[PDB]
Design an enzyme around this catalytic site. Structure first.
Site, PDB file in Angstrom:
ATOM      1  N   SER A 426      70.317  29.661  63.795  1.00  0.00           N
ATOM      2  CA  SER A 426      70.476  28.725  64.896  1.00  0.00           C
ATOM      3  C   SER A 426      69.186  28.003  65.312  1.00  0.00           C
ATOM      4  CB  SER A 426      71.071  29.444  66.110  1.00  0.00           C
ATOM      5  OG  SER A 426      72.437  29.752  65.902  1.00  0.00           O
ATOM      6  N   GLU A 524      78.595  27.732  57.722  1.00  0.00           N
ATOM      7  CA  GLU A 524      78.169  28.064  56.357  1.00  0.00           C
ATOM      8  C   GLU A 524      76.674  28.364  56.245  1.00  0.00           C
ATOM      9  OE1 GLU A 524      80.697  25.849  56.810  1.00  0.00           O
ATOM     10  OE2 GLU A 524      82.203  26.988  55.681  1.00  0.00           O
TER      11      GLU A 524
END
Ligand code: ZN
Ligand code: ZN
Length: 637
Positions: A426, A524
């Site tokens: 992230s 993904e």
């Protein structure tokens, strides 16, 4: 005139004033100065009356909101705690007691609404407002109810109404803008709409008030209620097995209860101002002084960090979290650290492997983080911090990446595996919004621009985006969700605005980062196959890139500050400062997410206006859109 050589204190009778008097007896033993604690009826009205003439108590305890008017009439003295003492209390509590630049009271206790739930009826309470309808159906079918709370007063309904972006008065540069009111915005509508929908669908009754809800919860008729610490004693007597937790989220964002800061002011007419300082700073605002007061009557939460950590140990707040949404964030952290609210260092940490769990990773990150704050001032690179980082790789059983950087100068303070490739997870999301803000500066993008998506565009861990399917979302909201709430679909939508992973990668290379690359989309890019170079960076490359976005001229001053703001919220929600700057009790958790009560006379009109609006949207006289339009007008033009 006020008598010298003694301390007279006024505090409300529902507070732990017998505990306070005990602290006064300890003060008497040490100084020979007697302290008298009294609870006059309507001391809130008696104080402004007598203090104007020059009489009354040496010290007055009341919630901060009332202290604005007191300090205007010149009824309170400026207090003088030094930096050492100020750092002992929560920073946000010092703002509640600030009036025209000056500190006019000592913050003591913190009060806000919490979710109170029956553990026998509901051992795992909802984290979301949207899931309550279904819980109510499951409960009504067994002769019960999900939620009952006071709907008559806007104090109780506001946390839901403000959740999605509603507000009373905007607070900027340390001042309230009396022309900037947010009861009419889209966020206030959604919250009231949802509220009225709970009534329409019979999940709640529009006529429910304080006494009805309380009786219902204290008799085991309803699974949940929304109330404050003042209500606990009655629930204690009922013998209901209850817990107290964070208010549910509405649209993926926290409920925003009004926050009251019980504060101790010093009479401007007092000739004992120095003794009042001695007592308040060195006797009351200690763990022992607040324990004495709390033992008498619950303070809920306190402004003193050290004792709030003791309050947080109370079993009532204890929750069982099952979601693995924090999994990505425990494998990748980026943080701009700095004191006084000003960032001066950048930290980048990656964890790896398929062995360690989320909690084990979060704990190791928290330990590195506590070690960093412990050895601030030393400059960075303390051998202790390096051991903690080395410990993380040890106990996690896999490679850990680490770098610490001075933001301004680019100097490397500490490093571990800084030139090895790690999956970004992230951590690319700050860079994505850096690219976004780059487009804003070039007049190619608007932060207020609204994006449409359907359920088909949704991927996993998208708590904000999934709740804005009908109204879509704004670029500014998308970035906020991507960074602060780690919303995966938010990231993809933002990627699409700039042209996909290839354009983010190109943007990074154009500013001199030829290492970092994003190749895939969410979810993904989180696959993290060993030795796979897709969607990867290096600790040093990431630190430097981030540094260039928060420094120099790559972004305007406007865009740079916005990126800083987003990164801080991610930091205080992430595991990094979870040991160093820990979460407190449930009351404190709700207060930190909430809205400090504005201390301005204009708040009076707000209460009436919102009260009417909620009544009229619930009954039918007005629609939600119309009711809040009228309420807004009644407050500001
Ligand atoms: Zn929204
Ligand atoms: Zn390149």
């Amino acid at each position: 005139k006020i008598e010298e050589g003694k301390l007279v204190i006024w505090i409300n009778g529902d507070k732990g004033y017998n505990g306070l008097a005990e602290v006064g007896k300890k003060f008497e033993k040490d100084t020979g100065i007697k302290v008298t604690v009294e609870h006059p009826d309507k001391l809130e009205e008696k104080f402004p009356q007598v203090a104007a003439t020059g009489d009354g108590p040496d010290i007055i305890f009341w919630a901060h909101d009332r202290f604005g008017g007191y300090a205007q009439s010149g009824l309170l003295a400026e207090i003088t705690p030094d930096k050492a003492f100020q750092d002992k209390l929560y920073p946000f509590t010092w703002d509640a007691v600030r009036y025209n630049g000056k500190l006019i009271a000592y913050p003591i206790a913190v009060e806000a609404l919490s979710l109170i739930y029956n553990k026998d009826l509901l051992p795992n309470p909802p984290k979301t407002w949207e899931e309550i309808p279904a819980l109510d159906k499951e409960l009504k079918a067994k002769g019960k109810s999900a939620l009952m709370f006071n709907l008559q007063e806007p104090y109780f309904t506001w946390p839901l109404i403000a959740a999605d972006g509603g507000y009373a008065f905007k607070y900027e540069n340390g001042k309230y803008d009396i022309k900037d009111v947010g009861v009419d915005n889209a966020g206030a509508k959604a919250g009231l709409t949802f509220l009225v929908d709970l009534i329409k669908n019979k999940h709640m009754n529009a006529d429910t008030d304080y006494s009805i809800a309380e009786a219902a919860f204290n008799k085991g008729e309803t699974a949940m209620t929304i109330n404050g610490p003042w209500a606990w004693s009655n629930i204690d007597t009922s013998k209901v097995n209850y817990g107290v937790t964070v208010l549910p989220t509405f649209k993926g964002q926290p409920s925003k209860p009004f926050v009251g800061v019980l504060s101790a002011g010093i009479n401007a007419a007092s000739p004992n101002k120095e003794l009042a300082k001695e007592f308040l700073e060195n006797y009351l605002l200690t763990d022992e002084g607040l324990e004495a007061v709390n033992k008498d009557k619950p303070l809920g939460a306190v402004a003193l960090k050290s004792y709030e950590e003791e309050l947080a140990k109370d079993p009532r707040w204890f929750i069982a979290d099952k979601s693995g949404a924090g999994e990505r964030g425990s494998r990748g952290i980026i943080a701009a650290l700095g004191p006084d609210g000003k960032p001066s260092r950048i930290v980048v940490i990656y964890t790896t492997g398929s062995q360690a769990t989320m909690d084990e990773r979060n704990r190791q990150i928290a330990e590195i983080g506590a070690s960093l704050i412990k050895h601030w001032g030393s400059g960075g690179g303390h051998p202790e911090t390096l051991v903690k980082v080395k410990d993380a790789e040890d106990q996690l059983g896999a490679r850990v990446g680490y770098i610490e950087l001075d933001l301004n100068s680019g100097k490397i303070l500490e490093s571990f595996r800084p030139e090895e490739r790690f999956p970004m997870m992230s951590t690319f999301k700050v860079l994505l919004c850096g690219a976004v803000l780059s487009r804003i500066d070039a007049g190619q993008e608007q932060l207020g621009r609204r994006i449409h998506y359907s359920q088909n565009d949704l991927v996993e861990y998208s708590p904000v985006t999934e709740k804005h399917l009908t109204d879509g979302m704004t670029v500014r909201e998308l970035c906020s969700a991507a960074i602060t709430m780690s919303d995966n679909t938010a990231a993809n939508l933002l990627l699409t605005t700039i042209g996909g992973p290839k354009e983010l990668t190109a943007f990074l290379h154009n500013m001199g980062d030829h290492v970092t690359r994003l190749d895939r989309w969410e979810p993904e890019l989180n696959e993290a196959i060993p030795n796979d170079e897709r969607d990867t960076t290096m600790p040093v490359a990431m630190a430097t890139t981030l540094r260039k976005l928060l420094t120099g001229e790559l972004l305007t001053l406007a865009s740079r500050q916005q990126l800083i703001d987003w990164m801080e919220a991610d930091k205080v929600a992430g595991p990094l400062l979870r040991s160093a700057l820990p979460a407190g009790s449930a009351t404190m958790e709700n207060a930190q997410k909430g809205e400090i009560m504005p201390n301005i006379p204009q708040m009076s009109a707000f209460w009436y206006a919102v009260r009417t609006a909620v009544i009229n949207a619930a009954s039918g006289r007005q629609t939600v859109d119309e009711a809040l339009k009228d309420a807004q007008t009644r407050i500001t033009k």
